[PDB]
Short mmCIF file of C-alpha atoms in Angstrom, two decimals:
data_model
loop_
_atom_site.label_atom_id
_atom_site.label_comp_id
_atom_site.label_asym_id
_atom_site.label_seq_id
_atom_site.Cartn_x
_atom_site.Cartn_y
_atom_site.Cartn_z
CA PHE A 1 9.60 -31.74 -0.45
CA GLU A 2 9.94 -28.06 0.48
CA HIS A 3 8.90 -25.32 -1.96
CA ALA A 4 9.96 -21.70 -1.43
CA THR A 5 8.17 -18.82 -3.15
CA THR A 6 7.39 -15.11 -2.70
CA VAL A 7 3.67 -14.34 -2.69
CA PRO A 8 2.38 -10.74 -2.95
CA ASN A 9 0.67 -9.34 0.14
CA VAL A 10 -2.67 -8.47 -1.44
CA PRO A 11 -5.65 -10.03 0.39
CA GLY A 12 -8.20 -12.04 -1.57
CA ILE A 13 -6.09 -12.63 -4.70
CA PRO A 14 -4.92 -16.26 -5.13
CA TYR A 15 -1.28 -16.78 -6.08
CA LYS A 16 -0.72 -19.95 -8.11
CA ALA A 17 2.41 -22.03 -8.61
CA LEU A 18 3.37 -25.47 -9.92
CA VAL A 19 5.80 -27.39 -7.72
CA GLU A 20 7.67 -29.85 -9.96
CA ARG A 21 9.51 -32.75 -8.34
CA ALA A 22 12.17 -34.81 -10.10
CA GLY A 23 10.10 -37.98 -10.56
CA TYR A 24 6.56 -37.09 -9.49
CA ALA A 25 3.66 -35.48 -11.31
CA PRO A 26 3.65 -31.66 -11.01
CA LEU A 27 1.44 -30.44 -8.17
CA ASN A 28 -0.63 -27.26 -8.07
CA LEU A 29 -0.20 -24.86 -5.15
CA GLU A 30 -2.59 -21.92 -4.67
CA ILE A 31 -2.14 -19.55 -1.72
CA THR A 32 -4.67 -16.90 -0.67
CA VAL A 33 -4.05 -14.34 2.07
CA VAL A 34 -7.61 -14.43 3.40
CA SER A 35 -6.91 -11.89 6.15
CA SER A 36 -4.03 -10.04 7.80
CA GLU A 37 -3.55 -8.21 11.09
CA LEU A 38 -0.75 -5.66 11.54
CA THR A 39 -0.94 -5.36 15.34
CA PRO A 40 1.51 -3.34 17.50
CA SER A 41 2.21 -3.63 21.24
CA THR A 42 0.67 -0.80 23.27
CA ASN A 43 0.94 0.39 26.87
CA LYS A 44 -1.62 2.77 28.36
CA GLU A 45 -0.08 6.09 29.39
CA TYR A 46 -3.29 7.59 30.80
CA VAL A 47 -6.98 8.29 30.23
CA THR A 48 -8.55 11.72 29.90
CA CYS A 49 -11.96 13.33 29.45
CA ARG A 50 -13.86 16.48 30.42
CA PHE A 51 -12.96 17.58 33.93
CA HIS A 52 -15.73 18.38 36.41
CA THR A 53 -14.62 21.47 38.34
CA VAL A 54 -15.86 20.58 41.80
CA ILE A 55 -15.98 23.57 44.17
CA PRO A 56 -16.10 22.63 47.88
CA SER A 57 -18.50 24.71 49.93
CA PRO A 58 -16.67 27.79 51.28
CA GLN A 59 -15.83 28.10 54.96
CA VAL A 60 -15.54 31.33 56.96
CA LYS A 61 -13.77 32.23 60.21
CA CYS A 62 -14.58 35.89 60.52
CA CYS A 63 -12.67 37.02 63.57
CA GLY A 64 -10.04 34.31 63.58
CA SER A 65 -7.48 33.45 60.93
CA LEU A 66 -7.35 30.69 58.31
CA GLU A 67 -4.37 29.30 56.38
CA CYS A 68 -4.59 27.44 53.08
CA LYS A 69 -3.55 23.81 53.54
CA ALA A 70 -2.14 21.46 50.89
CA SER A 71 -4.14 18.49 49.59
CA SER A 72 -3.56 15.76 46.99
CA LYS A 73 -6.49 16.52 44.68
CA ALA A 74 -6.17 17.16 40.95
CA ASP A 75 -5.23 20.80 40.31
CA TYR A 76 -6.04 21.72 43.89
CA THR A 77 -6.33 25.49 44.30
CA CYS A 78 -6.81 27.31 47.61
CA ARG A 79 -6.86 30.97 48.61
CA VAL A 80 -7.61 33.05 51.70
CA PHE A 81 -9.63 36.27 51.39
CA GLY A 82 -10.00 38.96 54.02
CA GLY A 83 -13.00 41.17 54.77
CA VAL A 84 -16.04 39.70 52.98
CA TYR A 85 -18.96 39.70 55.48
CA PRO A 86 -21.08 37.17 53.55
CA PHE A 87 -24.88 37.02 53.36
CA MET A 88 -26.86 33.79 52.89
CA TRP A 89 -30.58 34.39 53.52
CA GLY A 90 -30.98 36.42 56.74
CA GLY A 91 -28.61 39.14 55.55
CA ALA A 92 -25.85 38.28 58.03
CA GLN A 93 -23.85 35.05 58.51
CA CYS A 94 -21.11 36.51 60.70
CA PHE A 95 -19.91 38.53 63.68
CA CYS A 96 -16.93 40.88 63.85
CA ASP A 97 -17.75 42.24 60.39
CA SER A 98 -14.06 43.16 59.90
CA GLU A 99 -11.14 40.71 59.83
CA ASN A 100 -13.65 38.41 58.23
CA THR A 101 -11.57 35.74 56.57
CA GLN A 102 -12.94 33.20 54.09
CA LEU A 103 -11.27 30.13 52.58
CA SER A 104 -11.82 29.64 48.84
CA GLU A 105 -11.16 26.09 47.65
CA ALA A 106 -11.53 24.35 44.30
CA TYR A 107 -10.35 21.27 42.43
CA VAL A 108 -11.26 19.02 39.50
CA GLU A 109 -12.26 15.39 39.03
CA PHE A 110 -13.66 13.16 36.28
CA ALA A 111 -17.11 14.02 34.99
CA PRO A 112 -19.87 11.48 35.75
CA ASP A 113 -20.39 10.64 32.06
CA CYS A 114 -16.67 9.97 31.48
CA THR A 115 -17.06 6.17 31.69
CA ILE A 116 -18.23 6.25 28.04
CA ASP A 117 -16.88 9.46 26.46
CA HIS A 118 -13.18 9.28 27.30
CA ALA A 119 -9.90 9.03 25.40
CA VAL A 120 -6.95 6.71 26.07
CA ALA A 121 -3.37 7.72 25.25
CA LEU A 122 -1.10 4.91 24.04
CA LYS A 123 2.48 4.47 22.84
CA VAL A 124 3.06 1.82 20.18
CA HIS A 125 6.12 -0.25 19.24
CA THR A 126 7.26 -2.46 16.35
CA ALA A 127 4.24 -3.90 14.57
CA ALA A 128 3.87 -7.66 14.09
CA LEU A 129 2.08 -8.87 10.95
CA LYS A 130 0.01 -12.06 11.17
CA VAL A 131 -1.71 -13.51 8.08
CA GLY A 132 -4.48 -16.05 7.74
CA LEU A 133 -3.71 -18.20 4.70
CA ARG A 134 -5.74 -20.72 2.74
CA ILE A 135 -3.35 -23.05 0.91
CA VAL A 136 -4.56 -25.74 -1.49
CA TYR A 137 -2.09 -28.33 -2.77
CA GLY A 138 -3.16 -31.11 -5.11
CA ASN A 139 -6.58 -32.01 -3.73
CA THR A 140 -6.24 -30.89 -0.08
CA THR A 141 -6.92 -27.39 1.28
CA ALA A 142 -5.83 -26.04 4.67
CA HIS A 143 -6.52 -22.87 6.67
CA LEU A 144 -3.81 -21.56 8.99
CA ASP A 145 -2.95 -18.35 10.83
CA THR A 146 0.80 -17.73 10.71
CA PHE A 147 3.12 -15.05 12.05
CA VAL A 148 5.14 -13.18 9.41
CA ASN A 149 8.56 -13.05 11.08
CA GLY A 150 10.60 -15.73 9.26
CA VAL A 151 10.84 -18.27 12.12
CA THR A 152 7.48 -19.03 13.74
CA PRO A 153 5.72 -21.79 11.74
CA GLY A 154 2.08 -22.25 10.89
CA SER A 155 0.90 -25.86 10.99
CA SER A 156 -2.15 -27.71 9.63
CA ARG A 157 -2.01 -31.34 10.76
CA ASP A 158 0.51 -32.44 8.13
CA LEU A 159 1.56 -29.13 6.54
CA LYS A 160 4.30 -26.84 7.87
CA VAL A 161 4.80 -23.33 6.47
CA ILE A 162 7.09 -20.45 7.47
CA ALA A 163 6.45 -16.95 6.11
CA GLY A 164 8.19 -13.60 6.15
CA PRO A 165 9.85 -11.25 6.70
CA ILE A 166 7.87 -8.53 4.88
CA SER A 167 9.88 -7.03 2.03
CA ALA A 168 9.29 -3.43 3.21
CA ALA A 169 8.42 -2.62 6.81
CA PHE A 170 5.51 -0.25 7.34
CA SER A 171 3.21 0.82 10.18
CA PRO A 172 0.33 3.35 9.91
CA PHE A 173 0.56 4.14 13.65
CA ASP A 174 2.88 6.92 14.77
CA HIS A 175 4.71 6.58 18.08
CA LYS A 176 1.91 8.22 20.12
CA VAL A 177 -1.77 7.53 19.44
CA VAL A 178 -5.14 8.32 21.01
CA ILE A 179 -8.21 6.06 21.06
CA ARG A 180 -11.69 7.55 21.53
CA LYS A 181 -14.82 5.38 21.18
CA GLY A 182 -13.13 3.16 18.61
CA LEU A 183 -11.62 6.07 16.63
CA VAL A 184 -7.81 6.12 16.36
CA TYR A 185 -5.81 9.34 15.95
CA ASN A 186 -2.06 9.86 15.53
CA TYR A 187 -1.86 12.73 18.01
CA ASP A 188 1.28 13.70 19.94
CA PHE A 189 -0.21 13.83 23.41
CA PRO A 190 1.90 15.27 26.26
CA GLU A 191 3.85 12.80 28.36
CA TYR A 192 2.38 11.75 31.70
CA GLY A 193 2.79 14.45 34.34
CA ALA A 194 3.55 17.22 31.80
CA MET A 195 0.02 18.62 31.76
CA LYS A 196 -0.63 21.92 29.99
CA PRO A 197 -3.96 23.77 30.41
CA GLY A 198 -6.28 24.22 27.46
CA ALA A 199 -4.86 21.21 25.59
CA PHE A 200 -5.46 17.48 25.38
CA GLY A 201 -4.36 15.55 28.44
CA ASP A 202 -4.77 18.51 30.79
CA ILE A 203 -6.32 16.00 33.22
CA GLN A 204 -4.61 12.61 33.45
CA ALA A 205 -5.08 9.40 35.40
CA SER A 206 -3.95 5.79 35.12
CA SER A 207 -7.61 4.69 34.96
CA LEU A 208 -11.14 6.04 35.17
CA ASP A 209 -11.46 4.85 38.79
CA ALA A 210 -7.92 5.90 39.77
CA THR A 211 -7.76 8.15 42.83
CA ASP A 212 -4.36 9.60 41.83
CA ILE A 213 -5.88 12.09 39.39
CA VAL A 214 -3.48 14.86 38.37
CA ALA A 215 -4.52 17.90 36.33
CA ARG A 216 -3.41 21.42 35.40
CA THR A 217 -6.35 23.51 34.16
CA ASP A 218 -5.01 26.97 35.14
CA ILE A 219 -7.90 27.43 37.57
CA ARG A 220 -7.57 30.75 39.41
CA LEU A 221 -9.92 31.96 42.13
CA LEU A 222 -11.01 35.59 42.42
CA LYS A 223 -11.78 37.77 45.42
CA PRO A 224 -15.56 37.80 46.03
CA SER A 225 -17.25 41.15 45.37
CA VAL A 226 -21.03 40.74 45.68
CA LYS A 227 -22.29 40.80 49.27
CA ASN A 228 -24.02 37.44 48.99
CA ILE A 229 -22.04 34.28 49.70
CA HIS A 230 -20.48 32.74 46.61
CA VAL A 231 -17.01 31.76 45.41
CA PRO A 232 -15.88 33.19 42.01
CA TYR A 233 -13.28 31.47 39.84
CA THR A 234 -12.09 31.46 36.24
CA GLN A 235 -10.53 28.50 34.47
CA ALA A 236 -9.32 27.46 31.03
CA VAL A 237 -11.54 25.45 28.70
CA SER A 238 -11.58 21.66 28.74
CA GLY A 239 -8.67 20.66 26.54
CA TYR A 240 -10.48 17.41 25.79
CA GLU A 241 -13.32 19.34 24.15
CA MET A 242 -10.85 21.55 22.27
CA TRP A 243 -9.11 18.47 20.86
CA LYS A 244 -12.51 16.94 20.07
CA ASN A 245 -13.48 20.00 18.03
CA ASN A 246 -10.04 20.03 16.33
CA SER A 247 -9.55 16.25 16.32
CA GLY A 248 -9.46 15.98 12.53
CA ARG A 249 -10.15 12.89 10.49
CA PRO A 250 -9.40 9.60 12.33
CA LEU A 251 -6.96 6.91 11.19
CA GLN A 252 -9.86 4.82 9.86
CA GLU A 253 -10.03 7.27 6.91
CA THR A 254 -6.33 8.20 6.53
CA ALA A 255 -4.32 4.98 6.89
CA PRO A 256 -2.41 4.24 3.65
CA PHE A 257 -2.58 0.96 1.73
CA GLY A 258 -6.33 0.75 2.40
CA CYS A 259 -6.46 -1.28 5.63
CA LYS A 260 -9.24 -1.10 8.21
CA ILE A 261 -8.08 0.21 11.59
CA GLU A 262 -9.68 -1.82 14.39
CA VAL A 263 -9.57 -1.56 18.17
CA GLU A 264 -9.51 -4.05 21.06
CA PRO A 265 -6.72 -4.86 20.27
CA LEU A 266 -5.36 -1.97 18.18
CA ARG A 267 -4.55 -3.30 14.72
CA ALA A 268 -4.78 -2.69 10.97
CA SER A 269 -6.54 -5.45 9.04
CA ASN A 270 -6.25 -6.38 5.35
CA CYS A 271 -3.32 -4.14 4.43
CA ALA A 272 -1.86 -4.66 0.96
CA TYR A 273 1.86 -3.86 0.93
CA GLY A 274 5.09 -5.69 0.21
CA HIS A 275 5.71 -9.36 -0.51
CA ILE A 276 5.76 -12.37 1.83
CA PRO A 277 8.49 -15.00 1.28
CA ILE A 278 6.81 -18.30 2.18
CA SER A 279 8.36 -21.78 2.33
CA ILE A 280 5.97 -24.74 2.59
CA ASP A 281 7.08 -28.27 3.49
CA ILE A 282 4.63 -30.17 1.30
CA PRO A 283 3.98 -33.68 2.73
CA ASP A 284 5.31 -36.62 0.74
CA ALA A 285 1.83 -38.20 0.58
CA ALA A 286 0.46 -35.27 -1.44
CA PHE A 287 2.56 -36.10 -4.51
CA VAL A 288 1.77 -38.99 -6.86
CA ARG A 289 4.27 -40.59 -9.22
CA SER A 290 4.31 -39.48 -12.85
CA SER A 291 3.60 -43.11 -13.81
CA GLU A 292 0.06 -42.53 -12.47
CA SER A 293 -0.61 -39.06 -13.91
CA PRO A 294 -1.96 -39.06 -17.51
CA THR A 295 0.70 -37.81 -19.89
CA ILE A 296 -0.78 -35.97 -22.87
CA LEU A 297 0.63 -37.09 -26.21
CA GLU A 298 0.30 -33.58 -27.62
CA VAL A 299 -1.42 -30.24 -27.04
CA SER A 300 -1.90 -27.13 -29.19
CA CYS A 301 -2.95 -23.75 -27.78
CA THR A 302 -5.15 -21.20 -29.56
CA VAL A 303 -5.98 -17.96 -27.76
CA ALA A 304 -9.48 -16.54 -28.16
CA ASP A 305 -10.27 -12.82 -27.99
CA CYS A 306 -8.17 -11.61 -25.06
CA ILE A 307 -7.91 -8.37 -23.10
CA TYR A 308 -5.44 -7.16 -20.45
CA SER A 309 -7.79 -6.05 -17.67
CA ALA A 310 -7.84 -6.49 -13.89
CA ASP A 311 -10.36 -9.35 -14.02
CA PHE A 312 -10.01 -12.62 -15.96
CA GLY A 313 -10.10 -10.84 -19.29
CA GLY A 314 -8.95 -13.40 -21.83
CA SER A 315 -9.62 -17.01 -22.74
CA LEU A 316 -7.80 -19.74 -24.64
CA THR A 317 -8.42 -23.31 -25.81
CA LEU A 318 -6.02 -26.26 -25.67
CA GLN A 319 -6.74 -29.01 -28.20
CA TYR A 320 -5.09 -32.11 -26.77
CA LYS A 321 -4.59 -35.82 -27.37
CA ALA A 322 -3.74 -37.99 -24.35
CA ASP A 323 -3.73 -41.68 -23.37
CA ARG A 324 -5.94 -41.86 -20.25
CA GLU A 325 -8.71 -40.08 -18.33
CA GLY A 326 -7.48 -38.04 -15.37
CA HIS A 327 -7.14 -34.74 -13.51
CA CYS A 328 -4.30 -32.84 -15.19
CA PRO A 329 -2.98 -29.72 -13.39
CA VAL A 330 -2.69 -26.62 -15.60
CA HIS A 331 -0.39 -23.66 -15.00
CA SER A 332 0.89 -20.49 -16.68
CA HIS A 333 4.68 -20.11 -16.50
CA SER A 334 4.76 -16.34 -17.17
CA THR A 335 4.88 -13.77 -14.38
CA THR A 336 2.41 -11.53 -16.29
CA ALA A 337 -0.38 -14.08 -16.84
CA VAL A 338 -2.49 -16.04 -14.34
CA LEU A 339 -5.01 -18.76 -15.12
CA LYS A 340 -8.40 -19.09 -13.44
CA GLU A 341 -8.38 -22.89 -13.15
CA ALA A 342 -5.71 -25.06 -11.51
CA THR A 343 -6.82 -28.67 -12.16
CA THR A 344 -8.91 -29.82 -15.13
CA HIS A 345 -10.35 -33.19 -16.08
CA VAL A 346 -8.63 -34.62 -19.16
CA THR A 347 -9.94 -37.26 -21.58
CA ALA A 348 -8.21 -39.29 -24.29
CA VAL A 349 -8.87 -36.73 -27.05
CA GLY A 350 -10.59 -33.36 -26.96
CA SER A 351 -10.28 -29.67 -26.19
CA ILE A 352 -10.50 -27.66 -22.96
CA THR A 353 -11.04 -23.92 -22.47
CA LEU A 354 -9.10 -21.95 -19.85
CA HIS A 355 -9.66 -18.35 -18.73
CA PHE A 356 -6.76 -16.10 -17.80
CA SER A 357 -5.86 -12.57 -16.71
CA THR A 358 -2.89 -10.75 -18.27
CA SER A 359 -1.24 -7.37 -17.73
CA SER A 360 0.60 -7.36 -21.09
CA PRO A 361 -0.60 -6.19 -24.53
CA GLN A 362 0.46 -9.56 -26.02
CA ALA A 363 -0.54 -13.00 -24.76
CA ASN A 364 2.88 -14.52 -25.53
CA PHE A 365 3.28 -16.92 -22.61
CA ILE A 366 3.82 -20.62 -21.91
CA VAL A 367 1.00 -22.81 -20.56
CA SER A 368 1.87 -26.16 -18.97
CA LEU A 369 -0.59 -29.07 -19.06
CA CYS A 370 0.50 -32.16 -17.07
CA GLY A 371 3.99 -30.70 -17.16
CA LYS A 372 4.37 -30.34 -20.93
CA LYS A 373 4.42 -26.81 -22.32
CA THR A 374 2.74 -24.92 -25.15
CA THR A 375 3.51 -21.37 -26.33
CA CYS A 376 0.28 -19.37 -26.48
CA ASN A 377 0.84 -16.40 -28.81
CA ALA A 378 -1.74 -13.69 -29.53
CA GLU A 379 -2.48 -9.95 -29.25
CA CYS A 380 -4.54 -8.48 -26.40
CA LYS A 381 -6.49 -5.26 -26.93
CA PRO A 382 -6.67 -2.37 -24.44
CA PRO A 383 -9.63 -2.63 -22.06
CA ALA A 384 -12.92 -0.93 -22.91
CA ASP A 385 -14.10 -0.14 -19.38
CA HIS A 386 -12.11 2.61 -17.67
CA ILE A 387 -12.81 1.64 -14.03
CA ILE A 388 -13.32 -1.78 -12.43
CA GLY A 389 -14.34 -2.77 -8.92
CA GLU A 390 -11.73 -5.51 -8.48
CA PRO A 391 -7.99 -5.25 -7.70
CA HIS A 392 -5.44 -6.08 -10.36
CA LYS A 393 -4.33 -9.67 -9.74
CA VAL A 394 -1.13 -9.34 -11.83
CA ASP A 395 1.61 -6.75 -11.43
CA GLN A 396 2.75 -4.71 -14.43
CA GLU A 397 6.26 -5.39 -15.73
CA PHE A 398 8.37 -3.23 -18.08
CA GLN A 399 9.76 -5.55 -20.77
CA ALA A 400 6.42 -7.42 -21.05
CA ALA A 401 4.16 -4.34 -21.06
CA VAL A 402 5.53 -3.11 -24.43
CA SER A 403 3.71 -4.53 -27.44
CA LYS A 404 5.58 -6.62 -29.99
CA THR A 405 4.70 -4.19 -32.79
CA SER A 406 6.17 -1.24 -30.89
CA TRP A 407 9.09 -3.46 -29.87
CA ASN A 408 9.69 -4.23 -33.55
CA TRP A 409 9.56 -0.52 -34.40
CA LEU A 410 11.98 0.41 -31.60
CA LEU A 411 14.36 -2.42 -32.49
CA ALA A 412 14.34 -1.42 -36.16
CA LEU A 413 14.97 2.25 -35.36
CA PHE A 414 17.84 1.43 -32.99
CA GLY A 415 19.27 -1.13 -35.41
CA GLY A 416 19.31 1.51 -38.13
CA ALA A 417 21.70 3.64 -36.07
CA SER A 418 23.71 0.57 -35.05
CA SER A 419 24.07 -0.50 -38.69
CA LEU A 420 25.03 3.05 -39.67
CA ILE A 421 27.84 3.23 -37.11
CA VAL A 422 29.00 -0.30 -37.99
CA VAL A 423 29.04 0.49 -41.72
CA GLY A 424 30.93 3.73 -41.10
CA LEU A 425 33.54 1.98 -38.97
CA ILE A 426 33.94 -0.82 -41.52
CA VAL A 427 34.30 1.71 -44.36
CA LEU A 428 36.93 3.63 -42.39
CA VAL A 429 38.88 0.45 -41.62
CA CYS A 430 38.74 -0.69 -45.25
CA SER A 431 39.87 2.73 -46.49
CA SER A 432 42.78 2.76 -44.03
CA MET A 433 43.84 -0.75 -45.08
CA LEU A 434 43.61 0.17 -48.77
CA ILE A 435 45.73 3.27 -48.13
CA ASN A 436 48.31 1.11 -46.34
CA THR A 437 48.33 -1.28 -49.30
CA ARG A 438 48.66 1.58 -51.82
CA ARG A 439 50.91 3.79 -49.67
CA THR B 315 -23.18 18.53 -7.17
CA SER B 316 -20.48 16.45 -8.86
CA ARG B 317 -16.98 15.58 -7.64
CA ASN B 318 -14.09 14.28 -9.76
CA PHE B 319 -11.59 11.88 -8.16
CA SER B 320 -8.53 10.54 -9.96
CA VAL B 321 -8.18 6.76 -9.60
CA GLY B 322 -4.78 5.15 -10.14
CA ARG B 323 -3.77 1.54 -10.59
CA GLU B 324 -3.42 1.17 -6.82
CA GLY B 325 -7.12 2.05 -6.50
CA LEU B 326 -9.38 4.40 -4.57
CA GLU B 327 -11.89 3.96 -1.75
CA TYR B 328 -14.77 6.37 -1.15
CA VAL B 329 -17.42 6.45 1.58
CA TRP B 330 -20.53 8.56 0.93
CA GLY B 331 -22.56 9.24 4.05
CA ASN B 332 -23.52 6.18 6.09
CA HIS B 333 -22.98 3.73 3.21
CA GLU B 334 -20.25 1.12 3.40
CA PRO B 335 -16.93 1.99 1.70
CA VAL B 336 -16.79 1.37 -2.06
CA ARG B 337 -13.47 0.54 -3.73
CA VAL B 338 -12.64 1.01 -7.42
CA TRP B 339 -9.47 0.27 -9.41
CA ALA B 340 -8.39 1.94 -12.65
CA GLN B 341 -7.79 -0.22 -15.70
CA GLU B 342 -5.23 0.56 -18.42
CA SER B 343 -7.96 1.55 -20.90
CA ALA B 344 -5.96 4.28 -22.59
CA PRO B 345 -7.30 5.64 -25.92
CA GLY B 346 -5.20 4.25 -28.75
CA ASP B 347 -3.80 1.01 -30.12
CA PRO B 348 -0.57 -0.82 -29.13
CA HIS B 349 -0.77 -2.94 -32.32
CA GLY B 350 -1.56 -0.15 -34.80
CA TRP B 351 0.31 2.57 -36.66
CA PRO B 352 3.19 4.33 -34.85
CA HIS B 353 1.16 7.43 -33.95
CA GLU B 354 -1.56 5.33 -32.30
CA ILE B 355 1.09 3.45 -30.31
CA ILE B 356 2.74 6.70 -29.23
CA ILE B 357 -0.62 8.15 -28.14
CA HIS B 358 -1.51 5.00 -26.19
CA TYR B 359 1.82 4.80 -24.37
CA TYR B 360 1.94 8.57 -23.81
CA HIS B 361 -1.43 8.69 -22.06
CA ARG B 362 -0.49 5.78 -19.79
CA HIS B 363 3.06 6.96 -19.00
CA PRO B 364 3.96 10.38 -20.44
CA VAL B 365 7.43 10.68 -18.88
CA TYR B 366 8.58 7.21 -19.95
CA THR B 367 7.24 7.63 -23.49
CA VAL B 368 8.86 11.06 -23.82
CA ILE B 369 12.16 9.61 -22.58
CA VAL B 370 11.96 6.74 -25.07
CA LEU B 371 11.11 9.05 -27.98
CA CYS B 372 13.95 11.43 -27.07
CA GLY B 373 16.37 8.51 -26.84
CA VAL B 374 15.27 7.18 -30.23
CA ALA B 375 15.66 10.63 -31.80
CA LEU B 376 19.13 11.00 -30.25
CA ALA B 377 20.11 7.55 -31.53
CA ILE B 378 18.95 8.39 -35.05
CA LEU B 379 20.77 11.75 -34.96
CA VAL B 380 24.05 10.30 -33.70
CA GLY B 381 23.87 7.40 -36.16
CA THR B 382 23.31 9.76 -39.09
CA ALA B 383 26.11 12.05 -37.89
CA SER B 384 28.50 9.12 -37.52
CA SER B 385 27.64 7.77 -40.97
CA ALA B 386 28.15 11.21 -42.53
CA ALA B 387 31.47 11.68 -40.71
CA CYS B 388 32.72 8.24 -41.76
CA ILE B 389 31.67 8.83 -45.38
CA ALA B 390 33.40 12.22 -45.45
CA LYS B 391 36.56 10.78 -43.89
CA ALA B 392 36.51 7.99 -46.48
CA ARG B 393 36.22 10.65 -49.19
CA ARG B 394 39.21 12.49 -47.72
CA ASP B 395 41.26 9.29 -47.49
CA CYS B 396 40.44 8.02 -50.99
CA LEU B 397 40.45 11.41 -52.78
CA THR B 398 43.23 13.56 -51.30
CA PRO B 399 46.08 11.51 -52.89
CA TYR B 400 44.47 12.00 -56.30
CA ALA B 401 43.88 15.74 -55.78
CA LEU B 402 47.63 16.34 -55.27
CA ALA B 403 48.58 14.64 -58.57
CA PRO B 404 47.82 15.41 -62.24
CA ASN B 405 45.36 13.55 -64.45
CA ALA B 406 43.25 11.89 -61.76
CA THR B 407 41.96 8.95 -63.80
CA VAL B 408 39.54 8.04 -61.02
CA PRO B 409 37.05 5.17 -61.24
CA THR B 410 33.91 7.20 -60.66
CA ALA B 411 32.23 4.73 -58.29
CA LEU B 412 33.75 6.34 -55.18
CA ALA B 413 32.91 9.93 -56.10
CA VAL B 414 29.40 9.00 -57.24
CA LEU B 415 28.81 7.04 -54.03
CA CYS B 416 30.02 9.62 -51.50
CA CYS B 417 29.15 12.86 -53.34
CA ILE B 418 25.55 12.81 -52.08
#
């Protein structure tokens, strides 16, 4: 027997239902979303870090001529300077003091400490949500990780379940993201090859060890001025450091719906949003015929002091008379009231107490014990505590969130106007008919 | 110092220093009574949802106003219908139930 339902995607909150077959005892079904993982598919665009501006030792040919060649280094920059006449330690490193040409050369590479402090630029795609579920039916409980797509089934050894799709698609990751030491940022990094100096990704490479490093740091060499041999250059700041200073808060502290952003692989865990349609093929062996379950001859419900809070605020007591000792399943048939227990031992005669959480001002809902129903009616007070450290396990409706006293007042006030218009119309019709009679 | 943070039904999560995150959810503990006198009910449902309560109160007031206006118009039209033939004729020996009813 297959049962189809729509659980809410809120981790840690059991969702309870009572599957009722035609000729078998009703069976409890509690489903908890223990964990979830909204994971996208990512492809590395490049890695970046602080560049090390390596300056090759200058060379001099001081009555020949040198020409700047072309290399394949990252942001390779070469220049040729004329009369320099450089000094090293003896006050003269050259002959033919005029026509004294020097080759200035510079490029950039990855800094030695970049194997730890580096950022990776990724592009993400459609996110796939996968949920770990604990499902208990009757007496048997099963753990299963299932993909929320609507087709792929999760299986536990006799139990098949298919979940999804999510009611409302959502992904906290923008198209382009950056990962740095486990911190995720939704930054719009430049595309590979489109380096710009002074900004993130000014130096790019497919990997830390990649030899095809490409960079654009706006390095410009200057003509040497001091007599002594040195090579002067000026260059833009490390864009990686500038982004680091202006990185902003990461996605671990900005992702909506309160899910923890985790890396390796990139994912968002325990994210409460939308509803999961789930169909479970409950095995035939789980059910037991109603001829074996203990029917209760009668049951009367009396609600104790109740309260519509996030936790199990209220309590009630069912005074029952039955015919046998067993394991009756109990359920609440209202969408704005959830019981704490699911199966309770039942004796021939007695009373049993059940706790429940409600989101309505009035506990005016039906409770089913071994199938047969009882209308629990009461009034629930507003909560005393203003803040609680537990999520609301029941959603708030509109027609059930309005108290019966206020509903009576509103109905009376609207019915006054309705009766006034009806009386006026009836009086007009009667007057017209009397005129027609006496015309 | 002290910092105030509004917490809705969806909840809030705050991390102070190196401590683990702490999550808190707001109840519906509005000051008032849904099962009391009308003013208490209005206060309770105004603090929880001001826009919805204002809309409901305005709708109720409009319904009362239009109902009263319709009743008055129908009563006055009934007076016209049942009185104008007798005002155009002499010696209006009128059973006074109609005039007494719709004069006020």
